[PDB]
Amino acid sequence: VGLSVSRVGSAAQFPGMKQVAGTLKLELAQYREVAAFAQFGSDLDAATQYVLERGARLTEMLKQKQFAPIPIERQTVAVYAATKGFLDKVRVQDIVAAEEAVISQVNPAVFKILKANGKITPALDAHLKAELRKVKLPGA
Amino acid sequence: LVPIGRGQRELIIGDRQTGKTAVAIDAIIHQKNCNEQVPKAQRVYCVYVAVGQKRSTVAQLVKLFTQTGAMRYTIMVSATASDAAPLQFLAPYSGCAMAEYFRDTGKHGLIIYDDLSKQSVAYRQMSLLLRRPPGREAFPGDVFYLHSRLLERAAKLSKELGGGSLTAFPVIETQAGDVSAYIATNVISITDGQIFLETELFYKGIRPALNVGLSVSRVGSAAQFPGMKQVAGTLKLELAQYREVAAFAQFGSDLDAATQYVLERGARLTEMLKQKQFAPI
Amino acid sequence: PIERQTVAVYAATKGFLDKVRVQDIVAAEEAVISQVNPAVFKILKANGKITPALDAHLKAELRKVKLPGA
Amino acid sequence: APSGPFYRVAGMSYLRYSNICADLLRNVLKEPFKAKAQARQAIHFRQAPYVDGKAGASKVYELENGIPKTAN
Amino acid sequence: ATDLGGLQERITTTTKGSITSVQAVYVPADDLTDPAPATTFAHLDATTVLSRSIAELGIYPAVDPLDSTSRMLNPNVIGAEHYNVARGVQKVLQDYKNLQDIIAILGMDELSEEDKLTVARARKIQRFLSQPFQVAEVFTGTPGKYVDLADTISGFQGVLTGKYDDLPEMAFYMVGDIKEVKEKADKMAKDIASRKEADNKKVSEELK
Amino acid sequence: SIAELGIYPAVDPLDSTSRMLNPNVIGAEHYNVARGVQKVLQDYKNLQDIIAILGMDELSEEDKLTVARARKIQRFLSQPFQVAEVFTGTPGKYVDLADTISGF
Amino acid sequence: ILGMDELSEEDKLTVARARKIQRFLSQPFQVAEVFTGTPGKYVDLADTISGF
Amino acid sequence: SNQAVKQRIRAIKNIGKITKAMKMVAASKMKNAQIAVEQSRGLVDPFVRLFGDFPAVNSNKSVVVAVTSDKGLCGGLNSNITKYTRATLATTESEGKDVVVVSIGDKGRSQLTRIESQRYQ
Amino acid sequence: EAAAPAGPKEFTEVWNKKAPSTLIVPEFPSNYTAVKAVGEGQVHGDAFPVNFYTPHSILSQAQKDTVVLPGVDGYFGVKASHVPTIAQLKPGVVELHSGAESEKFFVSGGFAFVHPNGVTDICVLEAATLDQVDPAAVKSALAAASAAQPTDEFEQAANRAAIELYSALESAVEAKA
Amino acid sequence: EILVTGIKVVDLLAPYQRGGKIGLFGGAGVGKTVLIMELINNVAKAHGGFSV
Ligand SMILES: Nc1ncnc2c1ncn2[C@@H]1O[C@H](COP(=O)(O)OP(=O)(O)OP(=O)(O)O)[C@@H](O)[C@H]1O
Ligand SMILES: Nc1ncnc2c1ncn2[C@@H]1O[C@H](COP(=O)(O)OP(=O)(O)O)[C@@H](O)[C@H]1O
Ligand SMILES: [Mg+2]
Ligand SMILES: [Mg+2]
Asked: Which residues pair with H100 in a beta bridge?
């Protein structure tokens, strides 16, 4: 991400993705600094460890398998579940399963209104705050 | 560490003033030391090919081989620096043709092409003046074929063809340790082993400066002395342990008594392998 | 000019520009060049050498300088 | 053999007696405070007498409940 | 190579006379793998490689002791103790060169005791290999020093075994032999004990 | 560098690829074991810059485990060759696929 | 690494001065007033020399 | 050749972040430990207020404890108090007293046995 | 009687004749203390300075007018110009009064010095304030204490130190406001 | 046979041969003309034969 650029993408993407991808790019930017810094986790600050845990959560969120492209409305709610709360309990090894738990467990009625309205309206923001809580995360 | 068999091609590669000629001259002198103790079909007749050197160096070597006694088994082919570039191009092939008498008739040869890189330089000169188009480092295209057809004549012949052998010791000089050069990678891809000599170990008192890590032998222990095989494997593994423990030895405050054990044992073996020149054991 | 350069180096190397703050020497040496009598410049440029009279008179006139701040 | 208080005649130094009393006070604290007072109780070091300047036997300490109440 | 060889092969000692040839060899852009210096290297008995990194350290003549070689450095030619002290100086200097990156990064205070002993002895023999030249006294002012061979062999054997650990590093800088380092250390420890009262002026109010 | 450690065959595990490394063709357990081996070896490669300066005393036993696991894996990827019996005195070993899957 | 409140009082004065200089180097642009709304202002040279 | 410096740049560029991470780790540890030092500094006052402070006593048996570090990237700390120890072991010893040398920290047991091999215990 | 008048100043010259001059003289722990014992003053009337101390925390550096210390002979009370004492404190309650207000730290034991300049230095190891002790785990501790019969004198003294703290801690939570 | 030069590094680590070819490598002001002037001044006056 540090070297890949899209020099038209500033307001040339999905508006619902643009709501969350600014915070995604900013909190990954702060992870790309301290990531090479703190390989260790013996003696940390409370501030750099928060950035390192959010960045590791977003990194293991963003990967995906081959030959399976996701629709934009279904990866938007995964990035919405990762840049907001809802995922800070699975360590790193469950976020691939936690995202699939999100996509399988969230009511598929929000995908239709996200795909149709283009962005996350505040009513859909309230139902997306709500419906992401009643999923069964596999973090045991 | 890198044992050499009767019939293989062993490259002596290093920088300038590191001990390549000294290793080769010990190889020549030891043959006179052993030829007085073996029967007729076990003697080795050395051929030393001196390409591009001075006449002073070749005169110093002929004096050394006379004072040792090794001249009665050695031929000295020497196309020096004042000679024409065709003569320096042809001196390794003439020396190999002179040693192929001993190969083809059941005796054993030891051909030493000192400065095969100087042959490559003379061949590049002779080709660039013949208007042949240059390539990488202005060498011709067939400079691999040049050393390939020379070094493939070092062979261990079958029992049907007399059983004679020819052992090549080509000498390549690198520039500041850069073995990634054109002629160096050519002859490294041709020869079986490598006797790589480092300048940084040469001034650490490790003389002959054999880099034990990068020096290999693709014949290996198939042509080693047994007895030397019984202890030299232990020597190889312990020196590998001493190599990998290093870059932690700057901190002698931090004792461990398990890595310090292999450190002191490897340093014992390192000082064991040092040897004064012109006196082969 | 070269005489006003060697008078500056003689003022700074012989300890006379001691005690001066290091952001004040660029004014203090202008004070050395301006306030000192120009006869030592003319003598030093004429005979081209610090004579045993001139260093005696030169330390004497380098004592009578108003270096800024003191 | 010795003479004095009940710890000095039991072969106990004053530091061990006072640390024993401090550990017994730390043990009966409230759980917002006894968990914080668990931190100042752990002893973690190792000693080794050097009779020659190069070697010596070692004794480690990995105690969590405090100073040893039994004699060492 | 043949141009340079056909020139350089006429500069030899024959049986009827002798030519002692000293040749300066420029290296282009301070590069020794350039083909003209690298070809000149084969034609010489003695080599004296002068380094810019050593001249910028104030050491003069700026000879790289780990790159200047000779054929006379042989115990069957120059003697056993001369060869031993030369190889000991070279081993101390190579062991110091192997520590330059870890001295740069971690600092001097992180080394072992044998490491910060051999670094100190190497810094002493680095300054002690420098020498004021008799032809270089017109732009430096320090006089020149012709050292005997026995003087420098004994003077370096002393620094190798450790007879002069207490001496400062800068006492070895630009001295002739091992007497002059002691005289320089005495003169430079008078300088840290030289204090005068009232600066013995007597300049003002001379008599006529 | 893999052969410099003595590990033979010196196959660089984070440089050797295959088109057969899809999970569609070698199944899920072989694919997950291969990717897990490559993952812990990339982790050892990223931690080797710390443990070559410090020496494994600042990893708080959360990545001290993966360094020993990766060292066991790098040793276990070596194998005696039947054609290398004449170099080194060790008989060759032919390992079946289910056995190396279960071992790794 | 240490904190805001660690440094001196002249350090606090230079921090406040440079934080208000960095804002004073910002300037709204007259071409940007159609998609930002706020008008931009051409500053004269002696005006910015006096202001700084 | 041209990948030698390309890999050396990688090695020094990673050291230039390892040492900065270690600098921030040391800074956070110093921030966490300064509040414990300042709380522990008070109790030393009543004993030097009651028992005084007498370093140059004519003791017959003395025990010298040099409080050093364990890890050795401190940069001139454990070697400086070894200078103070050899300047202090050569101050009280003027009359034939018995001295025990004790060291806390691995960089003390690595350095006090260097100059003092027999009185270290 | 005073055959070696040592000190921080007297150590300096014996150091400087046998230390290298590049090494500056080490500082001494008396240089970091602003109040001593011998010099008269620092009481001024009714309110005298009390320095409550633990190894891990400083509990008071304030000025009080009475402090009630649980000495080994019994709970005594230090007023302003008290006699200089070095009083070993058995496990009990230290009360620091600055007026009508009192703070009651139950301590674990450790000395208390009243000095000839009227300063008071309480020096205990563990000093919990009274509302943060668990009043139910005292009896379950001292039942296992008094029910433990040891054989060695070491564990006997440790058990005696257990009972002498726990019985005093019973009497420290029972009838207190 | 050795050629004593009076220079410490030359006589110790790379001794010159009386009747041998000697090279002085280095580029652009490192001192290989001052070194050859010192070799002239030290060797040529204590030689006896002719110089070129
Ligand atoms: N094992 C050794 N022990 C001691 N000295 C050695 C040893 N090997 C080589 N030398 C010395 O190294 C010096 C350089 O000669 P060497 O035989 O190294 O030439 P080379 O490196 O083979 O070829 P070139 O001179 O072209 O670089 C010689 O003076 C020789 O005495
Ligand atoms: N022995 C020496 N002592 C002091 N300075 C030296 C010495 N050798 C060289 N230098 C410096 O090097 C400069 C020129 O070196 P030079 O001999 O001209 O090298 P080159 O001939 O390679 O250009 C001189 O001006 C001098 O300052
Ligand atoms: Mg050679
Ligand atoms: Mg010149």
From this structure: H63
Output the 3-class SS for B168-216.
ECCEEECECCECCCHHHHHHHHHCCEEEEECHHHHCCCCCCCECCCCCC
User: What secondary structure letter does DSSP report for B143?
Assistant: H
Contacts of D38 in chain I (CB under 8 A): none
C-alpha angle with apex E9: E6 to E14, nearest 5 degrees?
145
Residues of B in contact with H111 (CB under 8 A): 253
* Distance of CA G6 from the midpoint of ligand 1 (Å): 62
Resolution for this experimental structure (Å): 3.2
| Distance to chain H for A57, nearest Cα, Å | 21
Method: cryo-EM
Q: How many beta-carbon contacts under 8 Å exist across G and H?
A: 6
| Residues E87 and E81: beta-carbon distance below 8 Å | no
Amino acid in the structure at residue A16: G
The CATH class of A14-140 is mainly alpha
Residue G21: other Cβ atoms inside 10 A: 11
Atom of ligand 1 nearest to the CA of E71: 29
Q: Mark whether A54 is an active-site residue.
A: no
> Could you tell me where the beta strands, DSSP code E, fall in chain E?
21-25, 46-49
F24 is in an annotated binding site: no
User: How many whole angstroms from its chain centre is CA C52?
Assistant: 16
CB-closest option in B220, B244, B247 to F87:
B220
Peptide bond into E61 cis (omega under 30): yes
Say which residues have a Cβ less than 8 Å from residue H72's Cβ, sequence separation at least 6.
B251, B253, B254, E110, H78, H106, H107
Number of H helices, E strands in chain I: 3, 11
DSSP state letters, E75-129 = TTTS-HHHHHHHHHHHHHHHHHHTTHHHHHHT-GGGS-HHHHHHHHHHHHHHHHT
CA-based end-to-end distance of chain J: 21
- For F49, phi and psi rounded to 5 degrees? -75, -25
* Dist CA B205 CA B273 (whole Å): 11
The total number of structural domains in chain D stands at 1
Pick the CATH number of B1-224 from 3.40.50.2300, 3.20.20.150, 3.40.50.300, 3.40.50.1370: 3.40.50.300
Helix B182-190 and helix B143-151, axial crossing angle in degrees, nearest 10: 30
DSSP string, F30-85: HHHHHHHHHHHHHHHHHHHHHHTTS-SSSSTTTSHHHHHHHHHHHHHT----GGGT
Do B213 and B1 touch, CB atoms closer than 8 A? no
Chain B nearest C-alpha distance from J42 (Å): 26
Contact (Cβ atoms closer than 8 angstroms) between residue E55 and residue J31: yes
Alpha helices in chain A (DSSP H): 15-37, 46-62, 72-83, 95-105, 109-117, 122-131
**Any idea what DSSP says for residue E198?**
G
Distance B222 CA to ligand 3 centre (A): 29
**3-class secondary structure, F27:** helix
Q: Which domain holds residue D44?
A: 1-72
The ligand 1 atom nearest the CA atom of E73: 29
Distances (CA, A) of F39 to B4, F31, F33, F70, G15: 41, 12, 10, 9, 46
Which amino acid is it at B104? D
A40 within 8 A of F50, measured Cβ to Cβ: yes
Helix or strand or coil: residue J21?
strand
- D69 and I133 within 8 Å at the Cβ level: the answer is no
Structural domain that includes position F71: 21-104
Cα within 13 Å of Cα(I56), Cβ side: 11
The CATH number for F35's domain is 1.10.1140.10
Backbone angles phi, psi at E158, to 5 degrees: -65, -40
